[PDB]
Design a protein around this ligand. Structure first.
Ligand code: ZDC
Ligand code: ZDC
Ligand code: ZDC
Ligand code: ZDC
Ligand code: CA
Ligand code: CA
Ligand code: CA
Ligand code: CA
Ligand code: CA
Ligand code: CA
Ligand code: CA
Ligand code: CA
Lengths: 114, 114, 114, 114
């Protein structure tokens, strides 16, 4: 199944934050309407924040997260969860190796903001 | 129901990160085994990270998030989600006022790390 | 926070199914735009299906699950989860007493159908 | 990533229920101890319940859902959600064709019971 693709409400501000847990340097690309809107790159085995940014979902609402390590795409897992019919999380994990911890880059998208 | 209480695997490192979206100054207490382990505070209407830390869940695994603003406990919402039977998110939103956006302090707990 | 309220897409067929795990007889009311659209009643301590139905989310998309035992509202817990940006679950648990198992009536809403 | 595999608490009763939404007849296999513990079969495009059962999660607690249509494995998507730290849902969708609706068989596992 496709993973890391989410339809946000259109024209809505959202936060995106990435954490790293791997010996490999992680590159996280965030696309809005198929166009790169943010890129974070960092390395940590202690869950450091390698980037955080406020974006806007634009006219289409389409948001896609991609993760790669030294140019190789990581395998993604994702889901969206909504609490009290209001608070939204779009969640991504990724695996760059063999251990299937799926935390090598962890990406959290949250909305609404403000 | 009770919200913001999670049973993590015991003796396991986890990340905890808080974001703010409110005119009010948020005070976020993170309790492990019923004792305060971290306190994040700050103010933002733009989803700023007001704290991020690595903690150990200890012998009980019990982690609780509490949020105060204006000297009163915010109303909390929460859930835990597990992806590919490996990657865990414990999610918290909170409401300090009347608009029920539930984003005034947003807390993300993630594990495993490393 | 309000629980058991979900915004579905307008005019969309959805499934609703309820299970019982309590000595109390469970009554599950499903409202679509604030009007009762289905009602299930039954008693089981073994997860029996007390009702399943297909409904239409109608013009508003607003679907509300209420659970009561002989007219007394149970405490509710709920969330929505979306898998691969397409498959939606709206989940409800409920507690009619003191033990906090939250399974006394369990309600699953799923869409799309077909 | 692997989908449809969940760690339940060991030696614990759980409910498993499947719904069908496809022209193809769905075959849902539920494994405990890596061995088939239940199989549900049926055909519906209207979310019919094609099986519901109570099982014990066994020695390991590992429960796996597989779905096939005329013997061909469907692609699976899954996640687990925990509400109020008590009520657990393990959720599966499956895709037998080209439309990416992932509802062709929908499987819900819930625990605890009683
Ligand atoms: C090696 O590069 C694998 C890599 O880094 C490890 C430290 C660990 O985080 C592993 O999960 C990750 O795939
Ligand atoms: C007043 O302090 C209310 C408060 O701040 C607003 C800017 C908005 O974020 C609202 O959701 C929050 O409760
Ligand atoms: C009353 O007996 C309590 C009630 O029924 C029990 C059998 C058990 O399911 C409990 O969770 C429920 O609240
Ligand atoms: C075959 O026709 C495809 C199959 O059945 C359809 C009626 C629809 O449910 C589709 O999602 C499913 O894959
Ligand atoms: Ca890894
Ligand atoms: Ca890792
Ligand atoms: Ca608010
Ligand atoms: Ca706010
Ligand atoms: Ca109960
Ligand atoms: Ca019960
Ligand atoms: Ca399909
Ligand atoms: Ca289908």
């Amino acid at each position: 199944a496709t993973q890391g693709v989410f339809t946000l409400p259109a024209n809505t501000r959202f936060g995106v934050t990435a954490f790293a847990n791997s010996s490999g340097t992680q590159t996280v690309n965030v696309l809005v309407n198929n166009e790169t809107a943010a890129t974070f790159s960092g390395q940590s085995t202690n869950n450091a924040v390698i980037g955080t940014q406020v974006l806007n979902s634009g006219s289409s609402g389409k948001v896609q997260v991609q993760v790669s390590v030294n140019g190789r795409p990581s395998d993604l897992v994702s889901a969206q969860v909504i609490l009290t019919n209001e608070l939204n999380f779009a969640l991504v994990g990724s695996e760059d190796g063999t251990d299937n911890d799926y935390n090598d880059a962890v990406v959290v998208i949250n909305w609404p903001l403000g």
